[PDB]
Write a protein that binds this ligand. Structure first.
Ligand SMILES: Cc1ccc(NC(=O)[C@@H]2CCCO2)nc1
Ligand SMILES: [Zn+2]
Ligand SMILES: [Zn+2]
Ligand SMILES: [Zn+2]
Length: 459
């Protein structure tokens, strides 16, 4: 059940305006054949150019929406549009490029895919709403064959040079002219009614349509993301480490303990309401407080309505004590909240563009996250950086400069001179906090929150 059988049927109705008279009965086998490629009865780890939904979801970091539009079929110029917002015009002789032959166009295609994908994926998955020209245009920039390895590293090969007769991965592909063993999924096979725009625009107001190839390419990928990650969710699917996943996750746990520990010391709430992950543990297990959990899965579509989370009658009294929302995205936090909220606008290898302003954050699991909205935080303020330790000043077992900081809140600093232990810990905590922030996480707190209140927790 692993790969998509070439003997599987392919619904051709989508193709019959670009390809009038196309048989209603077709396999992948005959489609790949008609696209001008030959699989050659090949057991060599590339059984089909086309892949399952399941496979496409494991390989989401690899998704590039692709669309081709006639300009005036060997006769006429072709507009090539990618979900990177690029358009190339190929001649048979937002970014909008003038008409140029295939021999140069294929070079630019390799450079674009390599720069976009080298820090994301080992492959490309062309995400299609297939009408004909996209499929018949592949012969001009794609070569297939047995799975191979990069000529300069152990990475699987994604590109091919006709100049040197060699193979490269995305990192080593400079000057290569062919996409090598790409993958593709036609979204129109999934069983929709009506065209791309009518389907896309059900879910998403953020991508317009200027009637240009890059726009459909963007809408195709967006609709695909909606289907696979918003409406359907799957937290059993794992995803490989490609960046600072582990450091970020650790950072997140250290900042959550720090911020909540201090909140309790400063304002001594009698009850904390912990709203979100139904797996959550007390992030401050020593704290005096009544710790009450409330279960809420990460909202992949629209942010939760605080009205529906709280009212309908818990501690019932959510206005008692403090509410901890740690990546539990609501429309408007109450005034007595500690909040961690993912900023969907961050640029990183972990954050992929999503649906209707949301982003798809892929760190071990894929989490589609609703658009970041500043108005949710109106009852709060941004939490300032600080470091709080009540740990003893005792070094144990760094090469040092004395730390001076107003935000190192320790006995040693109170006493005039920060000890070496607290300077090592302060600098590790600040590095973790910077990691987490640049990963796109933002921190918000009740307005009464004042780190001045922490100093008298030593006397
Ligand atoms: C990708 C692809 C798929 C099919 C075809 N062509 C056909 O099926 C023939 C030619 C005219 C109608 O029947 N060409 C390209
Ligand atoms: Zn390589
Ligand atoms: Zn969209
Ligand atoms: Zn100290």
């Amino acid at each position: 059940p692993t790969h998509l059988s070439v003997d599987t049927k392919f619904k051709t109705e989508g193709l019959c305006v670009d390809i009038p008279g196309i048989p209603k009965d077709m396999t992948y086998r005959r489609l790949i054949s008609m696209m001008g490629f030959k699989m050659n009865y090949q057991v060599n780890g590339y059984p089909n150019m086309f892949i399952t939904r399941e496979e496409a979801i494991r390989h989401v970091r690899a998704w590039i929406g692709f669309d081709v539009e006639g300009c005036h079929g060997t006769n006429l110029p072709l507009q090539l549009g990618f979900s990177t917002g690029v358009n190339l015009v190929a001649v048979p002789t937002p970014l909008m490029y003038k008409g140029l032959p295939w021999n140069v166009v294929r070079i630019k295609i390799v450079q674009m895919l390599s720069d976009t994908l080298k820090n994301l994926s080992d492959r490309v998955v062309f995400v299609l709403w297939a009408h004909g020209f996209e499929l018949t245009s592949m012969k001009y920039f794609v070569k297939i064959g047995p799975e191979r390895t990069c000529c300069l590293c152990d990475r699987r090969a994604t590109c091919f040079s006709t100049a040197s007769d060699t193979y490269a991965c995305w990192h080593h592909s400079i000057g290569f002219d062919y996409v090598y063993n790409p993958f593709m999924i036609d979204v129109q096979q999934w069983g929709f009614t009506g065209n791309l725009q009518s389907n896309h625009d059900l879910y998403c107001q953020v991508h317009g349509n200027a009637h240009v190839a890059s726009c459909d390419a963007i809408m195709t990928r967006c609709l695909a993301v909606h289907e696979c990650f918003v409406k359907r969710v799957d937290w059993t699917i794992e995803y490989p480490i490609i960046g600072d996943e582990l450091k970020i996750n650790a950072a997140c746990r250290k900042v959550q303990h720090m911020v909540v520990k201090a909140a309790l010391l400063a304002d001594k709430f009698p009850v904390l309401h912990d709203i979100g992950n139904p797996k959550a543990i007390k992030c401050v297990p020593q704290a005096d407080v009544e710790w009450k959990f409330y279960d809420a899965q990460p909202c992949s579509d629209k942010a939760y309505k605080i009205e529906e989370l709280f009212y309908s009658y818990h501690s019932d009294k959510f206005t008692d004590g403090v509410c901890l929302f740690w990546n539990c995205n609501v429309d408007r936090y109450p005034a007595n909240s500690i909040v961690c909220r993912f900023d969907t606008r961050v640029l990183s290898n972990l954050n992929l563009p999503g649906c209707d302003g949301g982003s798809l954050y892929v760190n071990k699991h894929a989490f589609h996250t609703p658009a970041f909205d500043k108005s949710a935080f109106v009852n709060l303020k941004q939490l300032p950086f600080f470091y709080y330790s009540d740990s003893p000043c005792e070094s144990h077992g760094i090469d040092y400069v004395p730390l001076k900081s107003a935000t190192c809140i320790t006995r040693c600093n109170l006493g005039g001179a920060v000890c070496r232990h607290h300077a090592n810990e302060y600098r590790l905590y600040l590095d973790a906090y910077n990691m987490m922030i640049s990963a796109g996480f933002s921190l918000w707190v009740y307005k009464q929150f004042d780190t001045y209140n922490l100093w008298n927790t030593f006397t």
